[PDB]
């Protein structure tokens, strides 16, 4: 195989990797790097071309294309450069220093996340997903581990990441929409199901569908058995609840679009610093 992207020699000439490993999966590792010229931080995502027997460069070219297509959306992580060596294609990506919104869903870090912030984070997530769906891209992997923050002290803006599952219109079980369990075709509605889960997790600090075992998880999804008890929802507003209950519905056709969701009353808010005109 001949290499397409810039050489590894250039990569090591222009960047230095740091000791902060940001993530590791079976065929991918992300590490922070720093430009030697400007000192600006990036995330270098190293993706193996060969997986489970399969030459996967084409699939990697597809993900690069999708990131490029979404370059103008500030809600989607920016792709700055690409390099390649014998086994890896390396993505130089915008650094999101706030880490994952999943961190804000753990009972640990949850007396520091107001209602205003959840409303704003969900609004931003919907703007990015609207932009993607307008372009016929369904993300298909919008777990809270895949939405980053530009900062957390203070709370910054959301960056959607990991387009490896992206398509035109069997992962972590608890985040799988029911239509995926039933093999139905890909729909924009699947991302909307996942937006329901993120709202549910930011607001309750619990997983809506996880069970003791995968078997129970799958039954929870296919039956849409979600806890909406007063214990879990005593400090969650009705409008937020309405938002979630409209997205977490079995029939994908009955879920509202991103567009309709952006007009939801839960998210209509006046910034009190501004002068309102009646
Ligand atoms: C501080 C930080 C903490 N945690 C993660 N988590 C994470 C989640 C999903 C993926 C999956 C992917 N890609 C990779 C890492 N990313 C961070 N910074 C990043 C990460 C990035 C780009 C996305 C890698 N920029 N800044
Ligand atoms: Cl990514």
């Amino acid at each position: 195989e001949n290499l397409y992207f810039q050489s590894m020699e250039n990569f090591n000439n222009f960047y230095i990797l740091t000791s902060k490993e940001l993530g590791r999966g079976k065929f991918a590792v992300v590490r922070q790097c720093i430009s030697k010229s400007t000192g600006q931080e990036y995330a270098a995502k190293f993706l193996k071309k060969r997986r489970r027997g399969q030459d996967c460069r084409a699939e990697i070219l597809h993900e690069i294309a999708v990131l490029e297509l979404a370059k103008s959306c500030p809600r989607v992580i920016n792709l700055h450069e690409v390099y390649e060596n014998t086994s890896e294609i390396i993505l130089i990506l915008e650094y999101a220093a706030g880490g994952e919104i999943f961190s804000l869903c753990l009972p640990e870090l949850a007396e520091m996340v107001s209602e205003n912030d959840v409303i704003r984070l969900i609004k931003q997530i919907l703007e990015g997903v609207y932009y993607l769906h307008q372009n016929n891209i369904v993300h298909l992997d919008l777990k809270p581990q895949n939405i980053l923050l530009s900062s957390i002290y203070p709370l910054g803006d959301i960056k959607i990441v990991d387009f490896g599952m992206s398509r035109k219109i069997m992962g972590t079980p608890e985040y799988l929409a029911p239509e995926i369990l039933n093999y139905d075709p890909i729909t924009t509605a699947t991302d909307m199901w996942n937006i329901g889960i993120i709202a549910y997790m930011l607001l309750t600090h619990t997983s809506p569908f996880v069970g003791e075992d995968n078997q129970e998880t799958y039954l929870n999804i296919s039956q849409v058995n979600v806890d909406y008890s007063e214990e879990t929802f005593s400090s969650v507003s009705q409008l937020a609840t309405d938002f979630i209950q409209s997205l977490l519905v079995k029939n994908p056709e009955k879920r509202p679009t991103a567009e309709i969701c952006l007009s939801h009353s839960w998210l209509q808010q006046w910034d009190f610093e501004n002068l309102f005109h009646p």
Side-chain angles (χ1 to χ4, degrees), residues 1-25 27-49 51-58 60-107 110 113-169 171-230 232-249 251-252 254-274 276-278:
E1 147 187 284
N2 312 103
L3 306 187
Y4 291 168
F5 296 100
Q6 309 232 120
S7 69
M8 202 56 184
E9 186 215 354
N10 282 1
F11 170 80
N12 282 292
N13 195 33
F14 287 128
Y15 297 97
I16 184 135
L17 287 168
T18 80
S19 55
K20 193 165 198 268
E21 188 181 282
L22 299 169
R24 189 171 284 271
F27 306 110
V29 43
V30 187
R31 194 171 275 280
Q32 181 192 45
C33 63
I34 299 173
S35 178
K36 297 185 181 179
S37 310
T38 67
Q40 168 64 227
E41 302 159 346
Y42 297 97
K45 178 168 196 211
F46 291 77
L47 305 170
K48 295 292 183 189
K49 288 181 281 196
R51 302 171 180 157
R52 315 175 202 80
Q54 304 159 334
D55 187 341
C56 299
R57 195 192 218 178
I60 299 160
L61 290 161
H62 176 85
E63 169 172 13
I64 296 171
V66 170
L67 285 169
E68 194 75 9
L69 167 64
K71 74 207 302 188
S72 66
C73 186
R75 307 311 188 219
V76 173
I77 201 63
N78 292 318
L79 182 59
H80 292 287
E81 270 188 331
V82 190
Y83 296 81
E84 178 174 10
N85 63 43
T86 303
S87 60
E88 289 156 6
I89 285 171
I90 311 179
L91 308 184
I92 308 303
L93 294 154
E94 174 181 8
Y95 187 68
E100 300 172 350
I101 59 124
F102 180 66
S103 314
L104 308 175
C105 301
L106 310 153
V113 187
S114 64
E115 172 159 39
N116 285 356
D117 296 331
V118 174
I119 286 163
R120 180 169 68 73
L121 297 177
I122 293 302
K123 194 173 155 183
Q124 293 192 358
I125 295 176
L126 287 162
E127 298 167 351
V129 169
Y130 170 74
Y131 171 96
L132 290 172
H133 294 181
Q134 282 296 106
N135 282 275
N136 302 309
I137 294 155
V138 295
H139 185 279
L140 292 184
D141 200 9
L142 287 174
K143 30 178 193 155
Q145 295 85 350
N146 286 340
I147 301 181
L148 307 186
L149 291 157
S150 66
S151 166
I152 61 176
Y153 297 119
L155 216 82
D157 304 325
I158 77 93
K159 302 300 172 151
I160 299 171
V161 300
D162 210 334
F163 286 78
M165 301 308 310
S166 284
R167 299 180 105 264
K168 301 314 194 85
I169 279 164
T172 325
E174 66 205 73
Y175 302 109
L176 295 185
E179 62 269 24
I180 294 153
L181 302 183
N182 228 50
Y183 301 106
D184 299 334
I186 274 40
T187 165
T188 59
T190 310
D191 283 346
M192 304 304 305
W193 172 274
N194 285 110
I195 289 176
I197 292 175
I198 295 148
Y200 186 105
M201 295 177 69
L202 290 165
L203 286 167
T204 67
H205 317 109
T206 60
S207 164
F209 294 109
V210 75
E212 292 286 292
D213 60 12
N214 291 350
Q215 189 176 335
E216 176 162 28
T217 300
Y218 288 139
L219 281 191
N220 289 324
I221 296 163
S222 63
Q223 303 165 359
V224 200
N225 179 243
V226 175
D227 165 21
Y228 293 115
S229 67
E230 47 155 323
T232 314
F233 276 71
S234 63
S235 80
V236 177
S237 72
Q238 179 61 49
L239 276 180
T241 309
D242 290 328
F243 182 94
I244 292 158
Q245 288 175 335
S246 66
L247 292 165
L248 298 186
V249 300
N251 193 333
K254 298 292 174 63
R255 302 176 202 147
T257 55
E259 197 177 358
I260 289 148
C261 282
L262 285 167
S263 279
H264 198 284
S265 292
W266 181 41
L267 306 182
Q268 306 311 302
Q269 197 174 89
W270 188 252
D271 182 59
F272 93 92
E273 303 264 324
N274 299 330
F276 181 87
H277 298 287

